[PDB]
Design an enzyme around this catalytic site. Structure first.
Site, PDB file in Angstrom:
ATOM      1  N   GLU A 357       0.680  -1.188   0.041  1.00  0.00           N
ATOM      2  CA  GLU A 357      -0.015   0.048  -0.049  1.00  0.00           C
ATOM      3  C   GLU A 357       0.587   1.120  -0.047  1.00  0.00           C
ATOM      4  O   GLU A 357       0.591   2.134  -0.664  1.00  0.00           O
ATOM      5  CB  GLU A 357      -0.876   0.195   1.229  1.00  0.00           C
ATOM      6  CG  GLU A 357      -1.770  -1.204   1.312  1.00  0.00           C
ATOM      7  CD  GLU A 357      -2.520  -1.321  -0.228  1.00  0.00           C
ATOM      8  OE1 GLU A 357      -3.316  -0.352  -0.670  1.00  0.00           O
ATOM      9  OE2 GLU A 357      -2.450  -2.394  -0.798  1.00  0.00           O
ATOM     10  N   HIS A 487     -11.873  -7.937  -5.194  1.00  0.00           N
ATOM     11  CA  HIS A 487     -11.544  -7.692  -6.716  1.00  0.00           C
ATOM     12  C   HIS A 487     -12.712  -7.878  -7.614  1.00  0.00           C
ATOM     13  O   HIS A 487     -12.829  -7.140  -8.340  1.00  0.00           O
ATOM     14  CB  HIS A 487     -10.238  -8.528  -7.008  1.00  0.00           C
ATOM     15  CG  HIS A 487      -9.136  -8.316  -5.941  1.00  0.00           C
ATOM     16  ND1 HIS A 487      -8.051  -7.871  -6.279  1.00  0.00           N
ATOM     17  CD2 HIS A 487      -8.997  -8.854  -4.677  1.00  0.00           C
ATOM     18  CE1 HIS A 487      -7.374  -7.605  -5.339  1.00  0.00           C
ATOM     19  NE2 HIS A 487      -7.812  -8.396  -4.477  1.00  0.00           N
TER      20      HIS A 487
HETATM   21  C1  XX5 Z   1      -6.951  -2.366  -6.243  1.00  0.00           C
HETATM   22  C2  XX5 Z   1      -7.297  -2.196  -4.653  1.00  0.00           C
HETATM   23  C3  XX5 Z   1      -8.852  -1.849  -4.782  1.00  0.00           C
HETATM   24  C4  XX5 Z   1      -6.887  -3.537  -3.727  1.00  0.00           C
HETATM   25  C5  XX5 Z   1      -5.381  -4.004  -3.643  1.00  0.00           C
HETATM   26  N1  XX5 Z   1      -5.359  -4.400  -2.172  1.00  0.00           N
HETATM   27  C6  XX5 Z   1      -4.638  -5.525  -1.658  1.00  0.00           C
HETATM   28  C7  XX5 Z   1      -4.688  -5.940  -0.309  1.00  0.00           C
HETATM   29  C8  XX5 Z   1      -3.752  -6.851   0.128  1.00  0.00           C
HETATM   30  C9  XX5 Z   1      -2.448  -6.797  -0.151  1.00  0.00           C
HETATM   31  N2  XX5 Z   1      -1.863  -8.018   0.118  1.00  0.00           N
HETATM   32  C10 XX5 Z   1      -2.969  -8.484   0.801  1.00  0.00           C
HETATM   33  N3  XX5 Z   1      -4.265  -8.185   0.639  1.00  0.00           N
HETATM   34  C11 XX5 Z   1      -5.564  -8.700   0.974  1.00  0.00           C
HETATM   35  C12 XX5 Z   1      -6.213  -8.167   2.379  1.00  0.00           C
HETATM   36  C13 XX5 Z   1      -5.234  -7.496   3.658  1.00  0.00           C
HETATM   37  C14 XX5 Z   1      -5.853  -7.160   4.812  1.00  0.00           C
HETATM   38 CL1  XX5 Z   1      -4.871  -6.654   6.120  1.00  0.00          CL
HETATM   39  C15 XX5 Z   1      -7.317  -7.102   4.935  1.00  0.00           C
HETATM   40  C16 XX5 Z   1      -8.244  -7.570   4.046  1.00  0.00           C
HETATM   41 CL2  XX5 Z   1      -9.980  -7.491   4.263  1.00  0.00          CL
HETATM   42  C17 XX5 Z   1      -7.521  -7.877   2.746  1.00  0.00           C
HETATM   43  C18 XX5 Z   1      -5.036  -6.761  -2.566  1.00  0.00           C
HETATM   44  O1  XX5 Z   1      -5.970  -7.528  -2.630  1.00  0.00           O
HETATM   45  O2  XX5 Z   1      -4.251  -7.210  -3.492  1.00  0.00           O
HETATM   46  C19 XX5 Z   1      -4.341  -3.097  -4.189  1.00  0.00           C
HETATM   47  O3  XX5 Z   1      -3.931  -2.231  -3.581  1.00  0.00           O
HETATM   48  O4  XX5 Z   1      -3.947  -3.508  -5.222  1.00  0.00           O
HETATM   49 ZN    ZN Z   2      -2.026  -2.929  -4.829  1.00  0.00          ZN
END
Ligand code: XX5
Ligand code: ZN
Ligand code: NAG
Ligand code: NAG
Ligand code: CL
Length: 597
Positions: A357, A487
């Site tokens: 992030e 997603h």
């Molecule tokens: C495009 C955005 C809307 C979503 C994305 N967020 C990450 C979040 C992430 C990074 N690594 C793992 N995760 C999943 C996740 C982590 C946590 Cl602490 C809570 C939840 Cl609900 C989901 C992803 O899904 O790849 C991103 O930043 O690319």
């Molecule tokens: Zn990302």
């Protein structure tokens, strides 16, 4: 004056109203994702509804300029975007239903609840609960309810609207000169203008295809190795010959097998390299994390997070009283406003996701000073592929050691290696086949190769050949499993994760060598090196004003996606998986079943 001037302004007269007009939406849009009241909903779909009308209008007042008749290449491609009738191509009071559909889908996800059978009042949101369980529980049964219930209770609701979603969204796509919506998201990767750098949409596909072969071997042995140590803790449940059951993968979807670490650690007695524990026995909190992360970028050039970020980012679920989408997201509201919404937890997962992030941010900034309608990363891969260039370095025992979660550790035993490298594999290789397959099905559908009555059909057939995974319960076409993975239900293309994964190592095999490293890249630090920070910097700043192919080329030799640097990272772990697996079977059955029994 020239006509390549009525635009050199028309654009700038645009970059200035839009930014604010945007920020007007991003801000309201943010009140929503931070408090799903409703009053906030409207405010939001009012802010973007005007930006809708704004961008729409300025689309016609834009195409008033003929195609070419323009030099300074930039001024032209910047024109490209605007000329394209947005999702306005839809029947005005029709696209509304799309939103209505879009908005729900979101709420359903970040709001849906499954309630304990033996106690109608113990209900669990997906974050946490369905989540903590699918990430910790070892009770094949707890694991199982959670998995099914979620897809059953909420998943099913999604279905109806998803069916409408592909349709509406498709019409918008194709009526925009594309084959479907998928052809659209494949757009992102496209480059024309430049010659020898041109990349086509139909390519992105077969380019993932090809790159996927060299990835299979390393997967199989990694999959056939964890079907083992997985039987070892769920005996009588998994066949030593047919793709593990969907709920023991380490998380709601099996997108990441990183939690199956304690069940698969190759030498579970050496110092745990999953500092998820050391973090608690030190009482690490949200801040401390996002502070220890921000500390990384600053060690390699890149600035510190802005005091505006520190004062608006929501780094922990506000708990009861206000419900916000908990999925970690890095926001860019423009106008210099940077924020991150993440319900941070003290896990090693949340330690790295922070580096992710944040990376998004360090980028969003790095290209801030750039024509608004152009500040946007070479392509999705690139944006995703950035925070992962950190987590790659800031997860190595080396770093982790010096950082704190691993005081003076046992040298670096030739064994702590296969140990550390197996975790990564768990996270990085685990996801590739999952990451791929999902987008494929996602394409197939928009394309057409899968008629409404065959969605959960191909989905599990697929989850079976490709991913190498089977379902614990026959799911009727009433379901919609691939719509319970955020997603999906909230748009967001998924293949950037595939591409990001390969970019990830190319950029790393270059920066190490740009910080003077002398070991395998899975030993590559990169911290404190401005030699490295600097390089990457000179990359991020260009925004999306240079075909990613060229950009890639100008950073790391190749001008396209290379699988080999990855294969190199995991070469040590691979040859070992070779050994360990010698007795175990490499491959899986596309006909098995944990229930048909
Ligand atoms: C495009 C955005 C809307 C979503 C994305 N967020 C990450 C979040 C992430 C990074 N690594 C793992 N995760 C999943 C996740 C982590 C946590 Cl602490 C809570 C939840 Cl609900 C989901 C992803 O899904 O790849 C991103 O930043 O690319
Ligand atoms: Zn990302
Ligand atoms: C915008 O939409 C109109 C009508 O649907 C169409 O004639 C026009 O070509 C579109 N914009 C461009 C230049 O593609
Ligand atoms: C090309 O012309 C544009 C508009 O006149 C100008 O802003 C830009 O700086 C020039 N080239 C670049 C990208 O420096
Ligand atoms: Cl699923």
């Amino acid at each position: 004056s020239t006509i390549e001037e009525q635009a050199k302004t028309f654009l700038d007269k645009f970059n200035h109203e839009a930014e604010d007009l945007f920020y007007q939406s991003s801000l309201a849009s943010w009140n929503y994702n931070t408090n799903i009241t409703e009053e906030n909903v409207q405010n939001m779909n009012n802010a973007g509804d005007k930006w809708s009308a704004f961008l729409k209008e300025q689309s016609t007042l834009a195409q008033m300029y003929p195609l070419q008749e323009i030099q300074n290449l930039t001024v032209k491609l910047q024109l490209q975007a605007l000329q394209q009738n947005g999702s306005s191509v839809l029947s005005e009071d029709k696209s509304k239903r799309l939103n209505t559909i879009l908005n729900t889908m979101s709420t359903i996800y970040s709001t849906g609840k499954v309630c304990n059978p033996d106690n109608p009042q113990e209900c669990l949101l997906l974050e946490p609960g369905l989540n903590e369980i699918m990430a910790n529980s070892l009770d094949y049964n707890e694991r199982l309810w959670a998995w099914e219930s979620w897809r059953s209770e909420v998943g099913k609701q999604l279905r109806p609207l998803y069916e409408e979603y592909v349709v509406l969204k498709n019409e918008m796509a194709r009526a925009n000169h594309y084959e479907d919506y998928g052809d659209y998201w494949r757009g992102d990767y496209e480059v024309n203008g430049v010659d020898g750098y041109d990349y086509s949409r139909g390519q992105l596909i077969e380019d993932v295809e090809h790159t996927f072969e060299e990835i299979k071997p390393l997967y199989e042995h990694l999959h056939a190795y964890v079907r083992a140590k997985l039987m070892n803790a769920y005996p009588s449940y998994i066949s030593p010959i047919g793709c593990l059951p969907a709920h023991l993968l380490g998380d709601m979807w099996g997108r990441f097998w990183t939690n199956l670490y304690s069940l698969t650690v190759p030498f579970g007695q050496k110092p745990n390299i999953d500092v998820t524990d050391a973090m608690v026995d030190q009482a690490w909190d949200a801040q401390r994390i996002f502070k220890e992360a921000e500390k990384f970028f600053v060690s390699v050039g890149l600035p510190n997070m802005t005091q505006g970020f520190w004062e608006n980012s929501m780094l922990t679920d506000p708990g009861n009283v206000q419900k916000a989408v908990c999925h970690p997201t890095a926001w860019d509201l423009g106008k210099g406003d940077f924020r991150i919404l993440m319900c941070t937890k003290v896990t090693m997962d949340d330690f790295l996701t922070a580096h992710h992030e944040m990376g998004h941010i360090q980028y969003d900034m790095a290209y801030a000073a750039q024509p608004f309608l152009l500040r946007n990363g070479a392509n999705e891969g690139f944006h995703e592929a950035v925070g992962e260039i950190m987590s790659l370095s800031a997860a190595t025992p080396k770093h982790l050691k010096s950082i704190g979660l691993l005081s003076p550790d046992f040298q670096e035993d030739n064994e702590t290696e296969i140990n550390f490298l197996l975790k990564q594999a768990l996270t990085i290789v685990g996801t590739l086949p999952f990451t791929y397959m999902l987008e494929k099905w996602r394409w197939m559908v928009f394309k057409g190769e899968i008629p409404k009555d065959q969605w959960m059909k191909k989905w599990w057939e697929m989850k079976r050949e490709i991913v190498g995974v089977v379902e614990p319960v026959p799911h009727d076409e009433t379901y919609c499993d691939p719509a319970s993975l955020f997603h999906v239900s909230n748009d967001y293309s998924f293949i950037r994760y595939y591409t990001r994964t390969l970019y990830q190592f190319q950029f790393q095999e270059a920066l190490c060598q740009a910080a003077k490293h002398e070991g395998p890249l899975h030993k590559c630090d990169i911290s404190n090196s401005t030699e490295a920070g600097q390089k990457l910097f000179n990359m991020l700043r260009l925004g999306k004003s240079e075909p990613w192919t060229l950009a890639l080329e100008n950073v790391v030799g190749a001008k396209n996606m290379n699988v080999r640097p990855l294969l190199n990272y995991f070469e040590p772990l691979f040859t070992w998986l070779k050994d360990q697996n010698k007795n175990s079977f490499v491959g899986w059955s596309t006909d098995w079943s944990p229930y048909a029994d």
